[PDB]
Structure formats: C-alpha cells, structure tokens
C-alpha cells in the first residue's frame, strides 16, 4: 500500500493473476508443498497479514486509507486466492468476529466490520462456496453475534437476490439452515437489544419473504413457533418507532395464511399496535401535521395490507378504524380501495370475508347501534356491488336462513331500549337482500 | 332461582348499556344478598363463582370499538358479588376442605383453598395495580373499575388473613417500580369536590371511598400498625407535597373520617396535617369547611398526640389563624360569624 504502485508492483500483478488460474485449474497444491494441513497456513497468514493487518496501519495511527482501487482488487485477489484452499473458512468463521474498534475520517467502527463490509462482494461471491457451514457458527456454534451476524445477511441479500449467473435455488438451500438456525436467535431476546439489532432482524425478515419465495415458507417450513412468535414479539417492541413499525407491518400480510390458533395473537398484537399508536379520537386533525402525515401513511398501509392479505382478520381490524367516526376525515381510500379488493377475489375468499363481517354483525355482544350499522353499510354492502357472479350463490346459501330467522317473530326489548339493535339487524338484512336482489335474476 | 335470573341476565351478552348492566347488579343483585338467612350463600355460590371467575382471569380487549366498559362492568360486578359473600363467608369455610373449595378448584383439591384464594388475591391486586399512564379513552369508567377492584380485596382479606403482619403486602406494598400510587388508580387527578359552610355534603359513595372508609374502622381489629400506611401516608406531606395535591381529598378526607380510629401513633402525622392545611388551597377558595374538621384532631377527641411544643409549630399555625381572618367577611351574619365563634375556642385548649 503506497506511492510506487505506478512503477514497482507489476511483479505482483504477475503473481495474483497467475496463481488464481492455476487453482481454477486445481493445480496449485502441487505448485506449493502443503506445510502441515489441506490449509497451506501461509494462506491463512496472508489473510491475517498480507491484508488483515496491512489494511489497518494503526501503529503510526495516521488515518485509515481510502484505498488506491487497483490495490483493493488485487488484495481481493489474495482473498479469492485464499478461498482456493482447504480449511480456510474454519479460521474466517472466527476472523470475522473482531471487536477492535477502528479510530479511523476519525469516526469509529469495528475492524471485523470494516473488513467484511469492505470485502462484501469479495467474500459474498466466494465464501458462498460454503453455504451455511459458517451460518451455523454465526448463530449457533457460537453466540449469535450482537451485530454483524445479521449484516452478513444484508451483504448476502444483495448477491443471493441478484443471483441467476449459472446458479439458483439460493433462497431454498439457505432457508432450511437459516430457519433451523433461527431457533438459536437469542441476542435479540435481550429487551434492550439495540435498535441496530432490531433493524437487522427486521431487514432480514423482509429479505426472507423476498429470497425464500413464500411457497418455501408456506405452512411449517421455517418453524413458526420460533420465527413468527419472534416477529410478533418484534411488533410488540415499545421502543420500535412507527416508520419501522411501518416496515414491520409491511411483512405482516404473508402471515395471514395461518389457520392455526397462532393467528389469535396476530389479531391481538395488531389491536395492541393500532390502539396504542393511532388516535382514539381521530377527529383532531386537519391535513399537514406529522401527527396526521405519518398516520395517513399508516392508514393506507393497513389498506395495502388488506389488499395483499385478502383477509377477514385485516377486514376485522379495519372495521374498528373505518367505523372510528362518521366522516373520519379520510373515507375515500377505505371506500375506493375496497373496489380493488372485491374485484380480483376468487369466490371462496369473498365468501369468507363477507361471513366474518356478517358473523361480527350477528354477534349479540353489547356494542352501539351505530357500530352494528356501520359494519353492515360502511363495509358489508360496500363489498357486494363490485365482484363477479358466484359471489351471490355461495354466500346466499350461508346467510339467508340464518338472517330471515330473526326477521320473522322478534320485536321486544323496548323495555330496557336496546331495541335499536333489533331494528338495526332488521334493516341490515333488508339492505343485504337489497344488494343481492339488485343482481338476482 | 331469583339471583340466578339476574345473574344470567347480567351474564347474557345481550346488546344493552353499561349503566343497564351495572344497575341490575348493584341496584338489585347485591341489594338482595345482605338480608337473608345462611344457605343462600352455599347453594348460589356453587352455581355462579366458577362461571364468574372464568371471565375475570384473561379477558381485557375491545377498547378498539370501545364497548370495553361492559368488560369492566362485569369485572366490578363480580368483585361486588364476591364482596357481599365474603362479608358473610367464615375464615376456615373458605380455606379448609369444605367441598365447594374442591369443586371451585381441581378434584377433591389438595391445597387449603390456597390456589382459588391466591388467584382471587392476584386478580383483585392486579385490578387495582393497573396504571392509567396511556389510558386516553373510557378514562373515568376504567378508573372506577380500578376503584371498585380495591373493595373485594378488603372483604376477603379481613376474613382469610386475620393478623397484622399479612396486611403490608396484599393491599399496599407498591415499591415505585413504575408509575407510583395505586390510590391514583382509585381517584383521577384534575377534578373537584366542595365543602360548604354551616348556619355527606360531598359523598362517601365515591367509588373507593365507600369500601376504604368502611374498612378502616375495622382496622381497629386489623391494624404493621405502620407499614400498610407508611409508604404513602407518612409521605403525603412536606418532602413530597405534590402527592396529596388533589389526592388529599383522598388522604385528608379519609383521615378526617378516620379520626375515630388512628390515635395510638397519630403523633408523627398530625403536625404535618396542620402543614397540609397550610397549603395554598384546601377544598374551597381556601379551607372553607375543611378547617372546621382539622382542629377536631385535638377538639373532637382531645387525646394522645399534640402538633406543638414537640416542634415549635409557630408561623404555620398563625397562617391557619390568619386563614380565619385576612379575608374573613361574609353575608347575613352566619357564615361570617362561623369563623369568629370558633376562633374564640381554637387557641384556648
């Protein structure tokens, strides 16, 4: 590393090219006699001390170099050349893990960080010849590291998500290890695990449903008792702030696939989230204050979440916010978005949607007659214009007997005067019948 | 049969107001349970109490549409159900193996009813522990629930835990690990009450005021004397004059309505009560009728402690005197003269 590279390191441009080819040809373990193991230990020391110490001239403590770029790629050539050889990664799987903070610029970060993060593509095209046989150590065959174990997957999910260059299945082969190994994700389980480690496992989980195409996270593929309960306890973080909550909920939707009682807390955590965060009185806001501006992003994001999930559980949550008042000052999105969600639905989906709001409307539970009418008019009827045919014949053949049975003989409770609930059911049914009989031949 | 119809009616999940659900329990169901013979306990108990406590133990949602006042009205309905029966239930008849202890726990149960009584104790405790820190909707109705939830604890503990050295924990032992006084779950802060002048007037039926003020006369039996009180009562004065700032309409009004009881170690608190009355307000534009009560610490019953000659009480007590004087004028002779004709008998004893 120095000024005469323009004049005197052609002697190294010679070597670095040559030896690489010789071990692309596999010959190089006859071109040097192996001293003690299938690792030529010189190769490990070249990592350690052609570069891992020479990248950091911390003896005179004159500032950490922005490399002369040719010298970066030949030093990457030494690293690449190191991966020509046996046993190498069995030191790297510790040589990553370096705590020494570089007093660089002059702002601080780790030498193991600087190394990995500089040599990201270098490692992250070539370490990959090993898949999980360091991920194993990274999570489990040592404590899942306080930080970078995860930045490993950030630098990974550039290239692995890029990867079609004569190889693929990257996510599939990854998944089956990184899920078993996700069992052992424990340093996050410190309450005060930094916003850094929260952000890491967050960005990772996004990039899971990205690389591990959800056909490969379908039912039990990654262990939901580990990885989903982890995501729920991530959403439940009260130090996790609302833009990052915003990404977190942006990967809720795929989990609306759960039929299990594991979904029970998916409603409760989203109830707990929105009720603590979003305004118990929404009437407060005219447009333009952050209190509103980042709230309307969250509002539209719950409608995106509905549009993706095709879910009666998101429908159910959404009823508590769309019915927050008459003229909650946004209504246009909650109305116009439903036009999109009712269009594409394959018939059994909307049969389930409608029944959740019907069952909700049917439930005798003490709640206001506004709240019962709003669910029918401001949502249930508001689904029944838009769709194809067959959305009639199925859903009809559920509700209409279980509806008309109430109409035909029940007329009391003027006496305590919740009677407005009886009649709200009765008009709810006439309005149910109205939309279907507008379509029934 | 009578009680079950009103219980089943209260239970039923028919859609109806939280007034309408509470009125059935309080204005009728409880209003049947004082008067009768015995056996009216043991039968009706052995219907409801499992089918009651099953709701208490895990259900806390529907803030989201906000019918939540029905959840808590059920919860206080049950604590008030438990309150009247545990006013009548004997000590051992709710720990020893009388077989309703078996059936309301598990099998012919192994413990001394310890699990059903400790789960009740945890639930009543938690239900008056619950902080109001983020509670931005249904505030009053949820606060009133935390109030009433203090009650049943009293009426079980006075029978199941007879002796002084249990009482520190089960209704009082809040280390400030977060959010301070359980008694601030029991009264909300920015609110008012009035104490008019002569020629009850604000009511003991305030939702914890009734069960606490009915207790403390019986704390003559169940006094350790100190410690269920110290961590709030010793400190609701100079040193932390903020904690009573409105909650003196707890601490002080309580203590006035406890001057029948507290005497044996009234020493350390009462000179700080004259300091407490030297506050910038005291239940009016000033002391109003409140001073009329406080002097009675020495002149309702002239016994045990003194605020003075122990400390040189001096200028603060002359503030209490000039409170009767600096702005003393009032109409029609009477309200004015009621300062005057009592100052004449204040300093003398």
Curated annotation (Swiss-Prot), chain B:
Signal sequence segment: none
Modifications after synthesis and translation: Autophosphorylated at two clusters, the T2609 cluster and the S2056 cluster. Autophosphorylation induces a conformational change that leads to remodeling of the DNA-PK complex, requisite for efficient end processing and DNA repair. S-nitrosylated by GAPDH.
Compartment(s) where it occurs, according to its Swiss-Prot or TrEMBL record: Nucleus; Nucleus, Nucleolus; Cytoplasm, Cytosol
Residues found modified as N6-acetyllysine: 175
Associated disease: Immunodeficiency 26 with or without neurologic abnormalities: A form of severe combined immunodeficiency characterized by reduced or absent T and B cells, recurrent candidiasis, and lower respiratory tract infections. Some patients show dysmorphic features, severe growth failure, microcephaly, seizures, and impaired neurological functions.
Family: Belongs to the PI3/PI4-kinase family.
Quaternary structure, from the entry: DNA-PK is a heterotrimer of PRKDC and the Ku dimer (composed of XRCC6/Ku70 and XRCC5/Ku86). Formation of this complex may be promoted by interaction with ILF3. Component of the core long-range non-homologous end joining (NHEJ) complex (also named DNA-PK complex) composed of PRKDC, LIG4, XRCC4, XRCC6/Ku70, XRCC5/Ku86 and NHEJ1/XLF. Additional component of the NHEJ complex includes PAXX. Following autophosphorylation, PRKDC dissociates from DNA. Interacts with DNA-PKcs-interacting protein (KIP) with the region upstream the kinase domain.
Protein role: Serine/threonine-protein kinase that acts as a molecular sensor for DNA damage. Involved in DNA non-homologous end joining (NHEJ) required for double-strand break (DSB) repair and V(D)J recombination. Must be bound to DNA to express its catalytic properties. Promotes processing of hairpin DNA structures in V(D)J recombination by activation of the hairpin endonuclease artemis (DCLRE1C). Recruited by XRCC5 and XRCC6 to DNA ends and is required to (1) protect and align broken ends of DNA, thereby preventing their degradation, (2) and sequester the DSB for repair by NHEJ.
Protein name: DNA-dependent protein kinase catalytic subunit
Species annotation: Homo sapiens
Range within the parent protein: 1796 to 2244 of 4128
């Amino acid at each position: 590393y120095g000024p005469d590279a323009q004049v005197d390191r052609s002697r190294l441009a010679a070597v670095v090219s040559a030896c690489k080819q010789l071990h692309r040809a596999g010959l190089l373990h006859n071109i040097l006699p192996s001293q003690s193991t299938d690792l030529h230990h010189s190769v490990g020391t070249e990592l350690l001390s052609l570069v891992y110490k020479g990248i950091a001239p911390g003896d005179e403590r004159q500032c950490l170099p922005s490399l002369d770029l040719s010298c970066k790629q030949l030093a990457s050539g030494l690293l690449e050349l190191a991966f020509a050889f046996g046993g190498l990664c069995e030191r790297l799987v510790s040589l990553l893990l370096n705590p020494a903070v570089l007093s660089t610029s002059v702002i601080h970060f780790s030498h193991g960080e600087y190394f990995y993060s500089l040599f990201s593509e270098t490692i992250n095209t070539e370490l990959l010849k090993n898949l999980d046989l360091a991920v194993l150590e990274l999570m489990q065959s040592s404590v899942d590291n306080t930080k970078m174990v995860s930045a490993v997957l950030n630098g990974m999910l550039d290239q692995s998500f890029r990867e079609r260059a004569n190889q693929k299945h990257q996510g599939l082969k990854l998944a089956t290890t990184i899920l078993q190994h996700w069992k052992k994700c424990d340093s996050w389980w410190a309450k005060d695990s930094p916003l850094e480690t929260k952000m890491a496992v967050l960005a990772l989980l996004a990039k899971i449903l990205q690389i591990d195409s959800s056909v490969s996270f379908n039912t039990s593929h990654g262990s939901f008792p580990e990885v989903f309960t982890t995501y729920i306890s991530l959403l439940a973080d009260t130090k996790l702030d609302l833009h990052l909550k915003g990404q977190a909920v942006t990967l809720l939707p795929f989990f609306t696939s759960l039929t299990g009682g594991s979904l029970e807390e998916l409603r409760r955590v989203l109830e707990q989230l929105i009720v603590a965060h979003f305004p118990m009185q929404s009437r407060e806001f005219p447009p333009g204050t952050p209190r509103f501006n980042n709230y309307v992003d969250c509002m539209k994001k719950f409608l995106d979440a509905l549009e993706l999930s095709q879910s009666p559980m998101l429908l159910e949550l959404m009823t508590e916010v769309l019915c927050r008042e008459q003229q909650h000052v946004m209504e246009e999105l909650f109305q116009s978005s439903f036009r999109r969600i009712a269009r594409r639905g394959s018939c059994v989906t909307q049969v389930g949607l409608l029944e959740s709001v019907y069952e909700m409307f049917r439930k005798d539970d003490p709640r206001l007659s506004f709240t019962r009418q709003s669910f029918v008019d401001r949502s249930l009827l508001t689904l029944l214009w838009h769709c194809s045919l067959d959305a009639l014949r199925e859903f009809f053949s559920t509700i209409v007997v279980d509806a008309i049975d109430v109409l035909k003989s029940r007329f009391t409770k003027l006496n305590e005067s919740t009677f407005d609930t009886q009649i709200t059911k009765k008009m709810g049914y006439y309005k149910i019948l109205d939309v279907m009989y507008s379509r029934l031949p | 049969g009578l009680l079950e119809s009103v219980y089943e009616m209260f239970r039923k999940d028919d859609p109806r107001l939280s007034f309408t659900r509470q009125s059935f329990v309080d204005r009728s169901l409880l209003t049947l349970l004082w008067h009768c013979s015995l056996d009216a306990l043991r039968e009706f108990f052995s219907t409801i109490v499992v089918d009651a406590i099953d709701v208490l133990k895990s259900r806390f949602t529907k803030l989201n549409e906000s019918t939540f006042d029905t959840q808590i009205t059920k919860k206080m309905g049950y604590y008030k159900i438990l309150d009247v029966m545990y006013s009548r239930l004997p000590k051992d008849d709710v720990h020893a193996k009388e077989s309703k202890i078996n059936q309301v726990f598990h099998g012919s149960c192994i413990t001394e009813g310890n699990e059903l009584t400790k789960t009740l104790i945890k639930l009543c405790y938690d239900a008056f522990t619950e902080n109001m820190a983020g509670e931005n909707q249904l505030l009053e109705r949820r606060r009133l629930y935390h109030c009433a939830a203090y009650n049943c604890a009293i009426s079980v503990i006075c029978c199941v835990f007879n002796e002084l050295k249990f009482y520190q924990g089960f209704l009082f032992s809040e280390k400030p690990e977060k959010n301070l006084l359980i008694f601030e779950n029991l009264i909300d802060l920015k609110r008012r009450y009035n104490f008019p002048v002569e020629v009850m007037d604000e009511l003991n039926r305030h939702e914890c005021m009734a069960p606490l003020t009915a207790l403390v006369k019986h704390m003559h039996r169940s006094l350790p004397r100190d410690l269920p009180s110290w961590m709030k009562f010793l400190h609701g004065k100079l040193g932390n004059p903020i904690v009573p700032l409105n909650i003196r309409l707890f601490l002080a009004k309580l203590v006035i309505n406890t001057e029948e009881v507290f005497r044996p170690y009234a020493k350390h608190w009462l000179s700080p009560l004259l300091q407490l009355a030297a506050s910038e307000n005291n239940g009016g534009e000033g002391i109003h009728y409140m001073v009329v009560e406080i002097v009675a610490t020495i002149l309702s019953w002239t016994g045990l402690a003194t605020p003075t000659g122990v400390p040189k009480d001096e200028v603060l007590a002359n503030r209490l005197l000039n409170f009767l004087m600096k702005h003393v004028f009032h109409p029609k002779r009477a309200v004015f003269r009621h300062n005057l004709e009592i100052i004449k008998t204040l300093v003398e004893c």
